[model samples]
Target chain A: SKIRIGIVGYGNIGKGVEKAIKQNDDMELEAIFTRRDINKVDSNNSKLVHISRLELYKDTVDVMILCGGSATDLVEQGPMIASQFNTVDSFDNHGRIPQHFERMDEISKKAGNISLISTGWDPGLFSLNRLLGESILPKGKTHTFWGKGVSLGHSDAIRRVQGVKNGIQYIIPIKGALDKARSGEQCDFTTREKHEMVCYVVPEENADLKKIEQDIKTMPDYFADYNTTVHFITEEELKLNHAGLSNGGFVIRSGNTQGGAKQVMEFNLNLESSAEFTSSVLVAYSRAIYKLSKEGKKGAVTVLDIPFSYLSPKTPEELRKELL
Target chain B: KIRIGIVGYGNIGKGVEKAIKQNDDMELEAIFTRRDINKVDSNNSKLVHISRLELYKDTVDVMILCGGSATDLVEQGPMIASQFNTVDSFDNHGRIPQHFERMDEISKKAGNISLISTGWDPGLFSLNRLLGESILPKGKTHTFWGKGVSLGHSDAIRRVQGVKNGIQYIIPIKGALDKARSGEQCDFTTREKHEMVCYVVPEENADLKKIEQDIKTMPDYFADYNTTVHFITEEELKLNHAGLSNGGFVIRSGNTQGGAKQVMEFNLNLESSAEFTSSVLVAYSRAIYKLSKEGKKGAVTVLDIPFSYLSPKTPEELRKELL
Candidate 1:
């Protein structure tokens, strides 16, 4: 039986999901839902439904991919939609995951539905890799570094600025600090010492530019800890040169055993498109949720709960007979 | 070329025997078992009994031991190394120092190298832990084992009096690992994070309390970790204990440039513990042969072997790829 996929937001990731759905033989796109005008949102694969009509098609789709932004959209939509249908998302807020997970678990159980969040690679595969590194090299230190480029991790604080209309955050790691950690040198590096934040903002016309620059520098989670800078540019300028969502990072553990023998194990990523990569992960876990939902497993889950083999469309016999 | 002689025709023995054929630098000379050599099935006519081991003293360059650590290897390793170069997977963690010390005296006197403790934990895990500590000088590390059967621990349980069969499950306490990962300066040991669960089929009329207490009080085997013992019947053991599944991780919490927590970890999971252990032993076997050619004599661990020494790759391949 083919899986019916419903996308909750018709943005970049939503279109990315539609392409991935058609790419897989066992999944087909069902519908696209957005808060925007049904006349405005266009999907060649399926008709766009008004976001309020989610309950009408609850039983029509096998899994609903939440393609909303992490800072605001997923925090509300994930729990709200999860109560009505099986939901999957790449909610990337690391600090608030426990809160998000608790809410997701509570309502998912009440409604007899399934919800999976943080299907994004970092907390998904990267989290697993970091744990694996820490678990196996119990005598070492872990170092995390982001690839230098546009990190679409646009923070809520940035959006809340008085004059800031549209923006993207760049998280750049220092090469010396990363190299020091990678080479297993004992160096005491702070967050401020290791990383710097650069912001590209398109300010609203007739707004206070000084307040925008001052407010972004002192924001708590995303900026206060780092050396920060801001650049003001037009919407066209930002879109033409800086709209690319390219991002990646590394998680490395370096340590030693008997007689100071060197042991360094690491995992890395270099993504051309974090959104598309994230969409690929959500689609894969959508396959997993479809299987688990059929088996009566109802609860909010992480990548830790999903069996790796379930993510693959291949049969066990074929994998062993051919791949092995 | 190094000539390999295998002792003990069990799981690891079968493994090492085949592995020698794949490595072009080594040759399988003979298969030696304690059983009557003629009666045991074999494709190699070179199979011989333990009594005939001395017969190939000059012919065989390395003696790969595939016996259990509980009894057989503790005795056979030194005896074999006194004549031919030797390698054994002796993996009783607490007793490693003592085992290596004895082998050092004997092997050095005999002018033959003996590579001791050649399996995963004492071998590869040991090397990684040392490297972790060296790279990040200030750190605390912990290791957690299976949700799978620990073959060595199980074998050790079988050697206990009044125990017919058993399997030991080493599990990491979740809260303890969190503290370890965060580099929290709590007063604790690595053994505190890891706890042991043992399921044993006791001999009938065996004092269950006696067996349980023995597991907890025994100095090297179980005393380090908090242990729980479950008593079961022989049939239950036969039904459930067949899988030799085993795996675990070693994670260390240290600091980077500004005291940020840098956690390092390595892990393994296996369908058959013996198969995994034997392959490691084969590599050490290759290592010992090369060391012997260099006139090295004494007990050595995987720690002492050059990183690329055991690979089948040529010097140029290692330089181009591994180096």
Candidate 2:
């Protein structure tokens, strides 16, 4: 008689979902499946009630939560949840969600399901914000998007390739760009901008007059005119001290259609702790699915469809208790 | 053991003349004055200062000049050198030599005396250490010269005493030590000695890095690309500091004549041709003058001399003026 729910991959984010679901009054946690058992997951709260695996009816459970960097891990479990469940709610963070999106028709035809993927803070919330912003002015022209993120990493081979690519950009860009234009070869231009940037590579030897000249002539198009001109200030500031890597975000500016209206959007995500982010996101999405069931909506839905106020605190006490 | 003749008593010429006096074994014999004034050193008792070219007839065994545009002097240097049975003229005429029609004739006459364009920026001063270190066998060279160019060098020093004012100031000799401690990669080369046909742009703005870049990208230079850019402290402007910048030599060797020419064009345009190359030429002539005056000149380049003398030990007076 109770609305059944199934969750996959009980990692840090997965745990956050469990926590978020427990905070809710109406929804009951049905079953949590991961590679490892959650039998040791001791909690004072009892509403996070788990059901046996056999309890899931192919047509009974109302929702499924798919959470992780990629959807490959959720492939097999998808069909079982979709066939039994009336709705599926998947939180994917990859650019291209595999299995479901790739085999969308096959999965839907078999289980009559819909999956929501690649829904996260920036790309997820920002995309929605963009659509909303565009609709308001309709005639708005110039637009820009800016945001911040936390990344801790290290790589030399990347720097070598990137640095050389950077050097070429710095030195021989006109020629390389011309070559690219002639060859009909288009490199990945991640963000939208017109002016190409400089890039170069310093050889093991310090004297690089010849290389300097050549680099000034052309740069690899794959790296040309991306977002901000990729300049490698070696051993620069804001570096991941432990890893010797750099952490930064990106910015983008859009040309205005003009003669109509002008608009610009800036988005930034400042994450002080990677661990906390993993916690907040999982809890946020879990709360989304819980609200759907309490409303008695029996069909499939997505985190994007859910309102954000569910995650906003109602009182000072609740605000203090919540991690923003 | 060596007699030296310093011609062209300008800033550079006077410096070389003074440098010769400071040397223990080297004697400043005769100065071929271009247009004489009273800046001649009073300490040197026997001075043979002359503007007439004929007066230099075997005046000294070799001639070392700190002067310019030897299009006129090319004939004189060879004529005097051939008459004196000398091998070469250590004249700072690197570019002017290319313009001479009687280049071969003069070169043959002064066959024993190479009218070398030494003491310029890319001249002998900066190149010898590079040769000894990178080109020499197992020679690990790091610039460990004087630490602090004294207040006396205030004249030659480019940067002021303080660091807060700017980063582009001339470094005292002491600053060069800090640079070494900081482990900055300088532009230099490493290779075996060869008739390896190296070319350098005789103009300024050709910073050593560009030259190194051009030379390094070529296959002929890469295989043991031996060249080290160390530092030097002249007696006049003792540079104990470096401007937190990279400096060095660039030798474009082997068949890339076109590439070499392009590289030269780029460097000559990089900085003032004078600032970039005067020191090297001075150093080169430092040796050429030594060999010439000692009557030991016979086809001398940078590599033929002892490494110690090329530390840019210019004259105290000349250093005072130039620094």
Candidate 3:
């Protein structure tokens, strides 16, 4: 039977999920939920509904995908949704993940549902890659580098800055640094030297520029350790130049075996649109959670907890015969 | 459904028996051990001796030969390939190239297929290492194994002139790991990076000097490493070197054009080398059955098989997503 899927927060990711669901024969897009007034919605599909009305169809939907941005939104939306329906969310705040897991697990367990958190690429596929590489090479070191692209988390941090009407951030990996790392050089390069955080901002009318600049630079987990630069620009410039949501990165591990045998492992992704790619990962995991829940599993789990076979639409026998 | 017959029921044999239970499409049809079938200690009704394997010739689809490279497999692999479609973990790396050729001839005449070295080091790790190299066209790689026991070395040692029984440990030089991780362009010889330590129990009034000399200079096994042979009583051997634990990593490191760096690796640690190796062989058994069904002949290694067929999952699950 096809899984019935209801989507929460119909943004770029939600739109991506809609398209991805249409492509996936094993899943059905039951409805799209949002905070916006339904009267003003653009879609002609009858499935669009307001977020406050989610409970009305709790029994109709199998999995509620939370696509609200990770920073402040998923922290609240994820725990609340887990109490009502089996849910999957890309809540990728690396620092708050432990607390997020505790909160999501508590709510999902009491409600007798399942919630899978941080199910996107970096926290998802790359998490598997790192675990796989490290388990095989316990004596090695791992180094991860992110993008020539925009990070949703960093852009959200920039948007939160006072005197910033709107903003975007790009993380650039210094080209020659990784070259040095591969050639047997130590990552003697500091985070500040290895990566540059570049930002574009549209300030509020009559806002103080100095404090805003200082606030952006001194932000604790987002920008303090990096070589960062900010440019205040017109809203038109922000729209014209820095509007797309593309991002990518890779994880590298250098290690050895008996007799000084050298080995290095890597996993990398180049996304033309981070939101679309992230939505694809979410949709794949959506299938996994549906199966896990049907089997009476309850709790906040992760991509690591889900079986790799569950992500595919085929039966185990089919997967073995076809893939094997 | 797949019906698999076991050729030898030792550590790896039992390991395969347990792993095969996890697959939905595979079943253990019979276990053919060389021991007395009555005392095989299994609860299953599938136990039989190798002498009666022909009885299961039309019953099981594939035969999984679980035996050691030095002691059993080399002899048994050829013998069994003539009787049925088979797979084995005959992991004597240096001799494998020639061994495979010889089996190819026998398999071609026998009208069946043989998948050799279908265990950990030469099995899953082989596929990973080949892919690691394929991904980085211009790079160097190193495979590190154990601060654990070497079953191949230990088995090979037991065959020497006066050795009653023994165990061998392949120790990775402590500094070699750090040096290789540092990424400096350094060449390492087997002696410089690894040393083989052997604990031997000599036969009564046995020639200790000859046994030690034979073990140290043994060809295709211990000659390449800094080998040390130590004599110990059977009690001490059992107390210390009892577990069959082994693991290693495959690393590929290099740079792309314009000097951008890239390093990739695959690693694993095993609590039971026999179990891990057995599980891998069980997985490959499926691939062998599929290949044999396709009418393929001669010896095959892990690299020849498609990546997806190795999984218990279907092709749809094995393929990547695009939309």
Candidate 4:
């Protein structure tokens, strides 16, 4: 009457699955294989048993749940599991490496079971939920942004500086507007190229006219200049129009033009609590798998690959109701 | 439903537990405990993983490994996330590339789970988020101001000045304010050693001719003036005010707080930092991530996006609340 499941990774998400099993009449738990040693478990509960890596096989487990955390070796384990497992689903939360699915390509095709990657709050469902699923506008343009601040000397951040480049960059400031508008002198100008908005700066010996254009081209957004640098002009300098530059902040973006929105969600998640987000991904994946299998639907699948309509959180009447 | 297993059960842990349960979509199934947890676990049918060892035996939808740092997480969190299908952890201690540098290969080999920064600055204000936040008001020279109380003592100030003075790096001239207010632009020119400036060939002029066009240009600089910069001094964290403008340094002159000019100055200084500060930081990351994932991972900021959409509240909500 129920499916017995063996959880390979028993962290935040593993706990959620176990809770679901207990709550759902259709599912039950078989055993657990934690990275830690089982000898330490002194709860004395027979149902709550632990198994070793060698003992984790399909014959012993009805299904194997792979928790997604670190990027390395996550895919390597798939081959071993696929060679000897019945059911397998991987939950990825912190998306350090996006290509985890590539590692299991060979086995996933043969196992014929879905291997879900990136199942967390932001990357998991919220992106699809808020951006695509609950979209109020009529396929209009969509924009996304996320913000966070960390002290300069944070050690871990320093180490992960390289990771930021995958989706992050450093910003440096080079100019301020007050330099040309000094004193009672009204400022105005026309550029080599004309446009709807006025492009002007007070001309001075130190002025880098080309740099201003370059700055405009390089900035992630139109308003970024105001956020990074604080221009300081003395009453005298304010009158004279002094100019200089400094840099700060960074940005990243993802989306589509008119089709189902492929949104990128951001979370200030910790390396530890990352699984909390992964669980959300798992929940989304489970829903997708349930529908695909029961309805006999198939395609190259992903959490986002699912249509926004399936999980829009709106009633059928709400989606396509007509008025008199 | 999510079953959260909190290891330390301290302030941050409680916060995470509370957030999980409060979210309508997720349910809190169980909590791991070092000692007996009488209220939730026993109050109802919620299962409690009593000991550290018992955690692996129990199955749950998710595990929140709370407390500790990158080192501790390196030591503990991964082991938990890897064992479980999912684990969310918050590290409150040491940090690092050190967390995974040497053992990263092993950590990856051990298990696969999400490892995110879940606490304060590191937890939520991840590097990506910070970079995004930095790019909001596009341009050169963004000042960073922390809102919390000065978490410091006196001796700190003196040491900083000492270090600043001892440094051999060039101390660039400060900016002036009058020109800054007017929005003046400056130029910066550089020349290569090969192209030394020289003029038409005469005994003396020929040498000058060696230089290609004798390239001359201007360096762009904003005349920033304001000496009221808060700096840590040997005695304490102090605010220094210079009387005149040179390059970046300028004097601070205004009335006292609760006074006229002083209050205006204070308001500008504080208002610039407090309002939209945190929101800007949070929103920036979301914007940049949206672009970076699309294969256009470049040094970017909030200025690049269609910003009206980035603000809080959907248009429908705005119509109800404000308009």
What TM-score fits each model?
Answer: 0.50, 0.31, 0.54, 0.29
Tens-place lDDT digits, model 1, residues B1-323: 78889998787787666556545677888888887545736544667888989999899998988886535667778898899999888867656776777888899999999988777777666654553443333456566664666666787777777787788888777877667555553546657767888988887466565645587777767889888998888898788767565656566665433344445555554555565566667767766777899899998776556444565555434222211
Ranking by DockQ: 3, 1, 4, 2
Tell me the tens digit of each residue's lDDT in model 2 across A158-249: 23442142232221123333233222222333243323333323333354545443433333444333432333333322132222111112
Q: Second chain of candidate 2: TM-score?
A: 0.40
Task: Score chain A of each prediction against the true chain A by TM-score and list the results.
Answer: 0.80, 0.50, 0.83, 0.47
DockQ of 3: 0.04
Global CA lDDT computed for model 3? 0.72
lDDT, model 1, position B209: 51
> DockQ, per-model, please?
0.02, 0.00, 0.04, 0.01
Query: For each prediction, how big is the interface RMSD?
Result: 19.2, 33.1, 12.0, 22.6
Q: Quick one: ranking by TM-score, best first?
A: 3, 1, 2, 4
Per-residue lDDT of model 3, residues B1-323, tens digit only: 89999877788788778778756678899888777646636555578877888877778888888876434666778888888888888776666765677677788899999887767677656655554433333456666786678766787898887888898898878677656544342678888777888889887565666646698788868889988888888999989878566667655554332223344555555556676666667777887888898999987776556433454554323222100
Q: What C-alpha RMSD separates each model from the true structure?
A: 24.5, 32.5, 15.0, 27.8
Error of 3 at A78 (Å): 36
The C-alpha stretches of model 4 lying farther than 4 A from their native spots are A20-25, A43-63, A68-75, A82-98, A126-141, A146-277, A290-300, A307-324, B1-323
lDDT of 4 by residue, A163-239 (tens): 21111122221122222211112233232111111122222344454554344333443323323322322335433
Evaluate residue A23 in candidate 4 and report its C-alpha lDDT on the 0 to 100 scale: 31
Cα lDDT computed for each candidate against the true fold: 0.71, 0.35, 0.72, 0.32
Model 2, range B1-323, lDDT digits (tens) per residue?
45556555654454455444434555666666645447556345434455454565655545554444445555555555454432222333333334223433454555454634333222332232332221111112333211121121222122222111111121123333333223232333233221122212222332343443333244532334332222222321224332212222222111110111000000111112222222233334444545555655444333334332333333222112111
lDDT string for model 3 (A1-324, tens) is 789998998788888777667657778999998888888776686989988898999889999999883235646878778899999988766766777777888999999999988778767767655554443344456667786788779899998988999989889887776665444323456787678888888999989988888899989999999878888999999899886566667666655432233445555555555666677778878887898999999997876555465676666434323222
Span of ten consecutive residues with least summed lDDT in model 4 chain A: A243-252
